């Protein structure tokens, strides 16, 4: 029921660049403390600039390490959250950075690539924009690949429970996807780690499956985090997913006993469609 | 807000056995293919028989390996699901076995110990019945200890979302707990791996927190399973948890792409309170 390129796409960079037909392509890498990996990621994409890709920015989500200077040294334009929308104070979390990035870019197509990937293939951006440029009716392109414990224990079982029409999607929370600016500026942006599951469910409720494609990116690798930082990610994924399914969420943060106690933040506050800022 | 023995309880086996006061104690080990571990588990408890513990059974949930003969060789009474309730056909899953075991035992207090524990401490049963025998108003005693990825990514975040009053419980899905027969035969029994989260939420909705205690069992170890068998456990945990929170569950099983497709069963069918079979 869901368009799925299962094996390596066949289009070439010149074919895809032809099919642009006046549309522009923006690439955004959100970065919070990724000095180790940001340079390899930028370098996998920058060859495409002025060709297929018209714009590449690194949205610096508050990095205190060498992310900014290493990204500058790789030729990337670096935008802080403040610089993307200065009149609006900054909130924490990933969803904030991706929402803000819509103001700092202008491509008709926006591509999101996580800045914590290790040895990312240089055909990621070409593989993601493929269905947008060639397919008709595609507005969102998620990716799948190949670890994935929030996805496989939280997101996918919960979608099976509440939005079973999205059971065919293989990586709902994937950080690598592309979508049209029209779609992105229409949708609200969940906070924190809810942003991906939120844009998936919202796109489906607004356009159905036939506007959603997914593409195989081979196999991936990234930081594999501690189980506790996943508890908080899981919580925010649940919070967002319940909201889009009309289920009230208590707003209570996950408390963990390490034994010593600590409560993690969870946000129920979405950012509005970027359209309202026109 | 929740009674919690944080460190090793102080009662001794003779003190606890005095506080029995005419009540009997039944111990149940549900077993599906546990030949490797069933003997060590039985042996940690059998010294207590005819003393604190009045009855120990192994409810054989369909084992095709040497679980039954090794359990017999360790002096345990072995009951099959058929033998516990012959007039009712057998359904799969853990919840079925624990429900059936209420018919095959008769203690005023029932203690459940997973038969897949490695080197279980012989004070587990004494530590679990402690609050039931000495405390007043305690009807359910959960355990905590010390891995725990369904618990920490699914159960606890979801309880925070939907039943935040149970955020203090440290291991909602723990297989080691004790409860009164009156409570257990009043409650329905979720199917499969939903049985623990179901008995927790149901007990709370019926008696509040002050009927629930939890006790430290130190540190544990068991099989650490594949991520896919956890996906299905997670699904059934979600299914049961949504039901007790009045949220409709689609009944759609989790589909996984290993890429090759496969859908796992999920059950929405609880067993009724064992009382209805009187
Ligand atoms: O407030 C935030 C949180 C995350 N990220 C980015 O989102 C991606 C996914 O974050 P995750 O925490 O899963 O990875 P890690 O922290 O291990 O690098 C990474 O590129 C982060 O730099 C971000 O820009 N802002
Ligand atoms: O249909 C079932 C499923 C599980 N169990 C028991 O429930 C406990 C927890 O099961 P789990 O699958 O988590 O452990 P494992 O299969 O790795 O031994 C174990 O003692 C199993 O023998 C059972 O008796 N019947
Ligand atoms: O699912 C998860 O728990 C992690 C993968 O990290 P693990 O190695 O599973 O701890 O990644 C999630 O978030 C990533 C960033 O947003 C996405 O790229 C993954 O699709 C998603 O699974
Ligand atoms: O939470 C889980 O995923 C597992 C622990 O296994 P893992 O090593 O975390 O894969 O155990 C759950 O189920 C057990 C049996 O019912 C319980 O004893 C645990 O409390 C529960 O966490
Ligand atoms: Mn990552
Ligand atoms: Mn176990």
CSV table of C-alpha atoms in Angstrom, one decimal, chain A residues 19-200:
chain,number,residue,atom,x,y,z
A,19,UNK,CA,13.7,16.7,-13.4
A,20,UNK,CA,14.1,19.6,-11.0
A,21,UNK,CA,12.3,21.9,-13.5
A,22,UNK,CA,12.8,25.2,-11.7
A,23,UNK,CA,12.4,23.8,-8.2
A,24,UNK,CA,15.2,24.3,-5.8
A,25,UNK,CA,16.6,21.8,-3.2
A,26,UNK,CA,17.7,22.8,0.3
A,27,UNK,CA,19.7,20.4,2.6
A,28,UNK,CA,19.7,20.9,6.4
A,29,UNK,CA,21.9,19.2,8.9
A,30,UNK,CA,20.8,19.8,12.5
A,31,UNK,CA,23.8,19.7,14.8
A,32,UNK,CA,24.0,19.6,18.6
A,33,UNK,CA,27.7,18.7,19.6
A,34,UNK,CA,28.7,16.6,16.6
A,35,UNK,CA,32.3,17.7,16.0
A,36,UNK,CA,33.3,14.1,15.6
A,37,UNK,CA,31.0,13.5,12.6
A,38,UNK,CA,29.8,16.8,11.1
A,39,UNK,CA,32.7,17.1,8.7
A,40,UNK,CA,32.3,13.6,7.1
A,41,UNK,CA,28.6,14.4,6.7
A,42,UNK,CA,29.0,17.8,5.1
A,43,UNK,CA,31.7,16.4,2.8
A,44,UNK,CA,29.4,13.7,1.5
A,45,UNK,CA,27.0,16.4,0.3
A,46,UNK,CA,28.9,19.5,-0.7
A,47,UNK,CA,30.0,18.1,-4.1
A,48,UNK,CA,26.3,18.4,-5.0
A,49,UNK,CA,26.1,22.1,-4.3
A,50,UNK,CA,25.3,24.4,-7.3
A,51,UNK,CA,24.3,21.2,-9.1
A,52,UNK,CA,21.5,19.0,-7.7
A,53,UNK,CA,21.6,20.7,-4.3
A,54,UNK,CA,21.1,24.5,-4.3
A,55,UNK,CA,21.7,25.1,-0.6
A,56,UNK,CA,23.3,23.3,2.4
A,57,UNK,CA,23.1,24.7,5.9
A,58,UNK,CA,24.1,23.4,9.3
A,59,UNK,CA,21.6,24.5,11.9
A,60,UNK,CA,23.7,24.7,15.1
A,61,UNK,CA,21.3,23.7,17.9
A,62,UNK,CA,23.5,25.2,20.6
A,63,UNK,CA,26.8,23.3,20.2
A,64,UNK,CA,29.5,24.0,22.8
A,65,UNK,CA,32.1,21.9,21.1
A,66,UNK,CA,33.9,22.4,17.7
A,67,UNK,CA,30.9,21.6,15.6
A,68,UNK,CA,30.6,25.2,14.2
A,69,UNK,CA,34.2,25.8,13.3
A,70,UNK,CA,34.7,22.3,11.8
A,71,UNK,CA,31.5,22.8,9.7
A,72,UNK,CA,32.7,26.2,8.6
A,73,UNK,CA,36.1,24.7,7.7
A,74,UNK,CA,34.2,22.2,5.4
A,75,UNK,CA,32.6,25.1,3.5
A,76,UNK,CA,29.2,24.9,5.1
A,77,UNK,CA,26.9,27.8,6.0
A,78,UNK,CA,26.2,27.6,9.7
A,79,UNK,CA,23.0,29.1,11.1
A,80,UNK,CA,22.2,29.2,14.8
A,81,UNK,CA,18.7,28.8,16.1
A,82,UNK,CA,18.8,32.5,17.0
A,83,UNK,CA,19.8,33.5,13.5
A,84,UNK,CA,17.0,31.5,11.9
A,85,UNK,CA,14.3,33.3,13.8
A,86,UNK,CA,15.6,36.0,16.0
A,87,UNK,CA,12.4,37.6,17.2
A,88,UNK,CA,11.2,34.3,18.7
A,89,UNK,CA,13.2,33.0,21.8
A,90,UNK,CA,14.8,29.6,21.5
A,91,UNK,CA,13.4,26.4,22.9
A,92,UNK,CA,15.5,23.2,23.4
A,93,UNK,CA,15.2,20.0,21.4
A,94,UNK,CA,15.5,18.7,17.9
A,95,UNK,CA,12.0,19.6,16.7
A,96,UNK,CA,12.8,23.3,17.4
A,97,UNK,CA,15.9,23.2,15.3
A,98,UNK,CA,14.2,21.6,12.3
A,99,UNK,CA,11.3,24.0,12.5
A,100,UNK,CA,13.6,27.0,12.8
A,101,UNK,CA,15.5,25.7,9.7
A,102,UNK,CA,12.5,26.3,7.5
A,103,UNK,CA,13.0,30.0,8.0
A,104,UNK,CA,16.7,29.8,7.2
A,105,UNK,CA,16.3,27.9,3.9
A,106,UNK,CA,14.2,28.5,0.8
A,107,UNK,CA,14.4,25.4,-1.4
A,108,UNK,CA,11.1,24.1,-2.8
A,109,UNK,CA,12.4,20.8,-1.5
A,110,UNK,CA,13.9,20.4,2.0
A,111,UNK,CA,16.2,17.4,2.8
A,112,UNK,CA,17.0,16.6,6.4
A,113,UNK,CA,20.2,14.6,7.2
A,114,UNK,CA,21.3,13.8,10.8
A,115,UNK,CA,24.8,15.2,11.5
A,116,UNK,CA,25.8,12.2,13.7
A,117,UNK,CA,26.0,9.7,10.8
A,118,UNK,CA,29.3,7.8,10.4
A,119,UNK,CA,30.5,7.4,6.8
A,120,UNK,CA,27.2,8.5,5.2
A,121,UNK,CA,26.9,7.5,1.6
A,122,UNK,CA,27.1,10.5,-0.8
A,123,UNK,CA,24.0,9.3,-2.7
A,124,UNK,CA,21.7,9.9,0.3
A,125,UNK,CA,20.4,13.3,-0.9
A,126,UNK,CA,20.0,11.9,-4.5
A,127,UNK,CA,18.2,8.8,-3.2
A,128,UNK,CA,15.8,10.9,-1.0
A,129,UNK,CA,14.8,13.5,-3.6
A,130,UNK,CA,14.2,10.8,-6.2
A,131,UNK,CA,10.5,10.2,-5.6
A,132,UNK,CA,9.8,13.9,-5.1
A,133,UNK,CA,11.3,14.9,-8.5
A,134,UNK,CA,10.2,11.9,-10.6
A,135,UNK,CA,7.1,10.6,-8.9
A,136,UNK,CA,3.9,12.5,-8.9
A,137,UNK,CA,1.9,13.1,-5.7
A,138,UNK,CA,4.9,12.4,-3.5
A,139,UNK,CA,5.4,15.1,-0.8
A,140,UNK,CA,7.3,13.1,1.9
A,141,UNK,CA,10.1,10.6,1.5
A,142,UNK,CA,11.2,8.6,4.5
A,143,UNK,CA,14.3,6.3,4.5
A,144,UNK,CA,15.0,2.9,5.8
A,145,UNK,CA,18.3,1.0,6.2
A,146,UNK,CA,20.1,-2.1,7.4
A,147,UNK,CA,20.0,-0.9,17.0
A,148,UNK,CA,16.7,0.9,16.3
A,149,UNK,CA,15.3,0.0,19.7
A,150,UNK,CA,13.0,3.0,20.2
A,151,UNK,CA,11.8,2.4,16.7
A,152,UNK,CA,11.2,-1.4,17.1
A,153,UNK,CA,9.9,-1.4,20.7
A,154,UNK,CA,8.0,1.9,20.8
A,155,UNK,CA,7.2,3.6,17.5
A,156,UNK,CA,6.3,0.6,15.3
A,157,UNK,CA,4.3,-1.3,17.9
A,158,UNK,CA,2.4,1.8,18.9
A,159,UNK,CA,1.6,2.7,15.2
A,160,UNK,CA,0.4,-0.9,14.8
A,161,UNK,CA,-1.9,-0.2,17.8
A,162,UNK,CA,-3.2,3.3,16.9
A,163,UNK,CA,-2.4,4.0,13.2
A,164,UNK,CA,-2.0,0.5,11.7
A,165,UNK,CA,-2.1,2.0,8.2
A,166,UNK,CA,1.5,3.1,8.9
A,167,UNK,CA,2.7,-0.5,9.7
A,168,UNK,CA,4.3,-0.7,6.3
A,169,UNK,CA,6.7,2.2,7.1
A,170,UNK,CA,9.9,0.5,8.1
A,171,UNK,CA,11.7,3.4,10.0
A,172,UNK,CA,9.1,6.0,11.1
A,173,UNK,CA,11.6,7.9,13.3
A,174,UNK,CA,14.4,8.0,10.7
A,175,UNK,CA,16.3,11.3,10.7
A,176,UNK,CA,16.9,11.1,6.9
A,177,UNK,CA,14.0,12.3,4.8
A,178,UNK,CA,12.9,14.9,2.3
A,179,UNK,CA,9.7,16.8,1.8
A,180,UNK,CA,8.2,19.7,-0.1
A,181,UNK,CA,8.3,23.1,1.5
A,182,UNK,CA,4.6,23.4,0.9
A,183,UNK,CA,4.0,20.3,3.1
A,184,UNK,CA,6.5,21.3,5.8
A,185,UNK,CA,5.3,24.8,6.2
A,186,UNK,CA,1.7,23.5,6.5
A,187,UNK,CA,2.5,21.1,9.3
A,188,UNK,CA,3.2,21.8,13.0
A,189,UNK,CA,6.5,20.6,14.4
A,190,UNK,CA,6.5,18.4,17.5
A,191,UNK,CA,9.2,19.3,20.1
A,192,UNK,CA,12.3,17.4,20.9
A,193,UNK,CA,12.6,13.9,19.5
A,194,UNK,CA,8.8,13.9,18.6
A,195,UNK,CA,9.4,15.8,15.4
A,196,UNK,CA,9.8,12.8,13.1
A,197,UNK,CA,6.8,10.7,14.2
A,198,UNK,CA,4.8,13.9,14.3
A,199,UNK,CA,5.5,14.8,10.7
A,200,UNK,CA,4.8,11.3,9.6
